[PDB]
DNA sequence: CGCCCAGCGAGCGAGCGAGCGCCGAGCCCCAACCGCCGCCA
């Protein structure tokens, strides 16, 4: 059952708000006095006297007129006498039984017209909005606000003594909290319990946010760190994304986020190792290259798997020795292009050799030549150990343990020093590499090793693991 | 023209009050009244109209009146 | 003669705005530094 919040501002100053009021009315209002009921505990000195009687008479006549014009004396109501910022007011409530919303205005106007020339004896109050109904929206166009039973304990009972003087009603549940703070607090707590029970009954959650999350996830799962691979893999998705104006910065943001997440939490074997199994590995190019040079395919695959996973520790490098165009550069470039963030050693630049090798996954050393000026840092980078370097036109940076591959025709152990050579640093470099004598030359129609071939080779390697002995010279197949 | 708007009448009244009191720089604004400078600065645009009004009042007081 | 249209009105709420606010990208001007030149045995 809804209720209408009728606001009635009770005049405070009878001389300023009700000029010309009869003396008998003021005398009767000042002579009347109330008393705390038997079951009461509120201070009577704080509560006023004449305003209380005025509000009582007002609400009584209002309720009688409502019951007479509605033809329904059996109806629920609720009155509460309070004190505004600088004027007394009330918060009367009447049920909607027999009085619709479209007729509330006419009944209120009739009650207003009946009030004057009867209670005030012709005199009218000066306080604006002395008898109206609370509307929904703030304005003349706002409709009637039909509150509920839960509106009393939510915007009336929580008040205190200075904001609550006397309240009249007929409901049994509210009849006890008419003039008592203990019952008021009890009912307020009992209602707040239910309010909390009903209320009970970071990550951004939105369609665009979830879509972007899934997009960046699926892009990182495929291995697209830049726009180069985005168009190569799926050129339609890039077009669909770039069509939106808001996607311009989002594309770069996703690329940077993927790159950072890979540089922080990702390993090379994850992308190097294929997902689906392989049933025919003999057709692979790496398998043929390894079988033509006499090397055991299974042993070479296990060595590569152990080197990619840093299983050997110090021996975390592979060196393909042999003439040019013998299956070294092909496999090296294939393994370097398969994984994102591949490095490149510039042996020609002795000042900044390990420049393009920071934040990489596969350090490629094409035609390397060890020298006395790059032997110390090389011994640390090849052995899988943290060490700082000096970049070209950039600040220094550390190179975490990352797999390294070398492919050259000259002797890497031989340390060159101008017009001479020394083999002092022979054992340190020999105990940290995997020499692969690839002396057999391939045919002109062999073709380059694609990216899927490396994945299939690594997958077949993971499926067939064998004991790999820590040695410099790899054992050739029988 | 002319154009009437609730957002322009306040600006015109502010310009008139500034020309009447004679606010030269922004320091005198706080001296004459702090609540006004706080309210006009609390807007979303912040300092998009304060400098404009200051320059307008200065130019008006310069071209019209003199020392 | 106690109803008659029936003529009147007073809102009356579900609409209509329109006007502002607060982002949202999107240009725009400005300052701490790079390239190239002057300066002497």
Swiss-Prot record, chain B:
Subcellular location: Host nucleus
Function: Plays an essential role in the initiation of viral DNA synthesis. Binds specifically to an inverted terminal repeat element (ITR) on the 3' and 5' ends of the viral DNA, where it cleaves a site specifically to generate a priming site for initiation of the synthesis of a complementary strand. Also plays a role as transcriptional regulator, DNA helicase and as key factor in site-specific integration of the viral genome. Inhibits the host cell cycle G1/S and G2/M transitions. These arrests may provide essential cellular factors for viral DNA replication.
Subunit text: Interacts with host TOPORS. Interacts with host KCTD5.
UniProt-recorded name of the protein: Protein Rep68
Organism: Adeno-associated virus 2 (isolate Srivastava/1982)
């Amino acid at each position: 059952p809804g209720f209408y919040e009728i606001v009635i501002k009770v005049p405070s100053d009878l001389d300023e708000h009700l000029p010309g009021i009869s003396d008998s009315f003021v005398n009767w209002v000042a002579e009347k006095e109330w008393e705390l009921p038997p079951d009461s505990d509120m201070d009577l000195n704080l509560i006023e006297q004449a305003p209380l009687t005025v509000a009582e008479k007002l609400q009584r006549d209002f309720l009688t007129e409502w019951r007479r014009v509605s033809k329904a004396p059996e109806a629920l109501f609720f009155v509460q006498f309070e004190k505004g910022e600088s004027y007394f007011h009330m918060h009367v409530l009447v049920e909607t039984t027999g009085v619709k919303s479209m007729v509330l205005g006419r009944f209120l106007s009739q009650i207003r017209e009946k009030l004057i020339q009867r209670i005030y004896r012709g005199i009218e109050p000066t306080l604006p909005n002395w008898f109206a109904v609370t509307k929904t929206r703030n304005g003349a166009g706002g409709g009637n606000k039909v509150v509920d039973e839960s509106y009393i304990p939510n915007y009336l009972l929580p008040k205190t003594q200075p904001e609550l003087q006397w309240a009249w009603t007929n409901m049994e549940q509210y009849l006890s909290a008419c003039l008592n703070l203990t019952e008021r607090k009890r009912l307020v707590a009992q209602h707040l319990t239910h309010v909390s029970q009903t209320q009970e009954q970071p990550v951004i959650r939105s369609k665009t946010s979830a879509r972007y999350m899934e997009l960046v996830g699926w892009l990182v799962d495929k291995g697209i760190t830049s726009e180069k691979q985005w168009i190569q893999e799926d050129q339609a998705s890039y077009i669909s994304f770039n069509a939106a104006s808001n996607s311009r910065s989002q594309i770069k943001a996703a690329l940077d986020n993927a790159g950072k997440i890979m540089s922080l939490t990702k390993t090379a074997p994850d992308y190097l190792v294929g997902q689906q199994p392989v049933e025919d590995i003999s057709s692979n190019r790496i398998y043929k290259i390894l079988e033509l040079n006499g090397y055991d395919p299974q042993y070479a695959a296990s060595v590569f798997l152990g080197w990619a996973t840093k299983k050997f520790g110090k021996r975390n490098t592979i060196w393909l020795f042999g003439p040019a165009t013998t299956g070294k550069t092909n496999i090296a470039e294939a393994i370097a292009h398969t994984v994102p963030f591949y490095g490149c050693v510039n042996w020609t630049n002795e000042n900044f050799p390990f420049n393009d090798c920071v934040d990489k996954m596969v350090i490629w050393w094409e035609e390397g030549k060890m020298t006395a000026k790059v032997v110390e840092s090389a011994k640390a980078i090849l052995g899988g150990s943290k060490v700082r370097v000096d970049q070209k036109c950039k600040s220094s940076a550390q190179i975490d343990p990352t797999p390294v591959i070398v492919t050259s025709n000259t002797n890497m152990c031989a340390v060159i020093d101008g017009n001479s050579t020394t083999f002092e640093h022979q054992q340190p470099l020999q105990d940290r590499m995997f020499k692969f004598e690839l002396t057999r030359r391939l045919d002109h129609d062999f073709g380059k090793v694609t990216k899927q071939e490396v994945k299939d080779f690594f997958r077949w390697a993971k499926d067939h693991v064998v004991e790999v002995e820590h040695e410099f010279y790899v054992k050739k197949g029988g």
